[PDB]
């Protein structure tokens, strides 16, 4: 008996001066089979915070319900909603609590900070988190990260104007990077759930990718 199974999934979060995009593929799988083609890996935690979880679907289901309860418990004792930074810290403690039987999940929390600016935090399967400007996680992370580093971080590029990222430019990047991942990753390519967090709430858009 093996307690874990790779269910596939690619997650991406990009932060902006006034926005945070959390995006995911919508295809759960097992071996060479597809469980469903409509399993978004993005989960709204608050009105300013969305988490994206990929890996063992069993653990992602448990962890997401554990966070929803931990958020309600905070609001009941502290009489306030947890900030994006508070959930990032609590998730590190939740993930480490299971260091000897870890959660096979890769999580990216994307939301707006207490100053109203985008904030992305990436987590390892055991708890180590980081405030990043953009992070890709999941099956096609190494296929999406090397390009955000160039197009968003302007890395390895000389004599180029470092313009700020608009939601328009950021959303085309998210769609384009996932379209390329659908081409070379067998675990990604049903549709793309894109959750954009702004002071006006969390809007969710779904594009389509390549069914195999």
């Amino acid at each position: 008996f093996s307690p874990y199974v790779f269910n596939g999934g690619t997650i991406l979060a990009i932060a902006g001066e006034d926005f945070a995009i959390v995006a995911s593929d919508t295809r759960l799988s097992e071996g060479f089979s597809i469980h469903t083609r409509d399993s978004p890996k993005c989960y709204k935690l608050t009105d300013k915070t969305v988490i994206g979880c990929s890996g063992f679907h069993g653990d992602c289901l448990t962890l997401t319900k554990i966070i929803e309860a931990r958020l309600k418990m905070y609001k009941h004792s502290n009489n306030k909603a947890m900030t994006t930074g508070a959930i990032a810290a609590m998730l590190s403690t939740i993930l480490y609590s299971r260091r000897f039987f870890p959660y096979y999940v890769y999580n990216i929390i994307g939301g707006l900070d207490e100053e109203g600016k985008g904030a992305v935090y990436s987590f390892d399967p055991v708890g180590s988190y980081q405030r990043d400007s953009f992070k890709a996680g999941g099956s096609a992370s190494a296929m999406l990260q090397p390009l955000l580093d160039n197009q968003v971080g302007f890395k390895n590029m000389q004599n180029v104007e470092h313009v700020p990222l608009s939601l328009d430019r950021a959303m085309r990047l998210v769609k384009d990077v996932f379209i390329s991942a659908a081409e070379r990753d067998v675990y990604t390519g049903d549709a793309l759930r894109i959750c954009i967090v702004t002071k006006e709430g969390i809007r969710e858009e779904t594009v389509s990718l390549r069914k195999d």
Binding site: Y74, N79, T83, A89, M90, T93
Partner: protein
């Protein structure tokens, strides 16, 4: 005859009502909340010249933004102040944020009434805590002052006096408190009311004053700074 958890015909719990009388025998402690911060003042009540006045600690720090004034059985408070300090550090480790003063007051007030002799626990408390606490701090809501009693009840107080002369300082407090009052005016008002209730002559060694201000951390006034305010008093 009656165990610790027996209700009176008036439904009040005798052990909780005798612990309140225990506070009425404590050194008067005054707390005032202003926009510019919260001031906590207490009467040291020294017994002999051979005692070291510094050893009498009635105002303690739970965290950089939270201080506490105690009155009643001081030894009972030690365990309550320890819970407040650990709960604040646990909140930091888990959420990387300062705990609100209401959340610290709620965490300590929960330990009260958790007593009994019916095998409630291996290390269960036997009786209520005979102490009243005045928590003063600055959260995201601003300068805040809460009062907790041996009944497990906590309240937000703009100005509160606990101890032996509470039934007199509170009257004086309700006659000199204005929402617009400054921290300096509050600090002077605390010492004036304390000097009146205090049996000994208020000096820079027979009183303890501390203040939590929006930017500055919990600060226990030293003899030099206390002497300055006591000069005007």
């Amino acid at each position: 005859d009656r165990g610790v958890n027996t209700f009176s015909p008036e439904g009040r719990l005798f052990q909780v009502e005798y612990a309140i009388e225990a506070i009425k025998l404590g050194s008067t402690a005054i707390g005032i909340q202003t926009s510019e911060g919260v001031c906590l003042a207490v009467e040291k009540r020294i017994t002999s010249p051979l005692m070291e006045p510094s050893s009498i600690e009635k105002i303690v720090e739970i965290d950089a933004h939270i201080g506490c004034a105690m009155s009643g059985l001081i030894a009972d408070a030690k365990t309550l102040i320890d819970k407040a300090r650990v709960e604040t550090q646990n909140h930091w480790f888990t959420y990387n944020e300062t705990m609100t003063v209401e959340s610290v007051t709620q965490a300590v007030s929960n330990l009260a009434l958790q007593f009994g002799e019916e095998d409630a626990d291996p290390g269960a408390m036997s009786r209520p805590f005979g102490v009243a606490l005045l928590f003063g701090g600055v959260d995201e809501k601003g300068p805040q002052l809460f009062h907790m009693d041996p009944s497990g009840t906590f309240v937000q107080c703009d100005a509160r006096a606990i101890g032996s002369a509470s039934e007199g300082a509170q009257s004086s407090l309700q006659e000199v408190y204005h929402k617009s009052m400054t921290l300096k005016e509050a600090i002077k008002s605390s010492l004036i009311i304390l000097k009146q209730v205090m049996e000994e002559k208020l000096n820079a060694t027979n009183i303890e004053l501390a203040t939590v201000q929006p930017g500055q951390n919990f600060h226990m006034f030293t003899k030099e700074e206390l002497e300055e305010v006591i000069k005007d008093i």
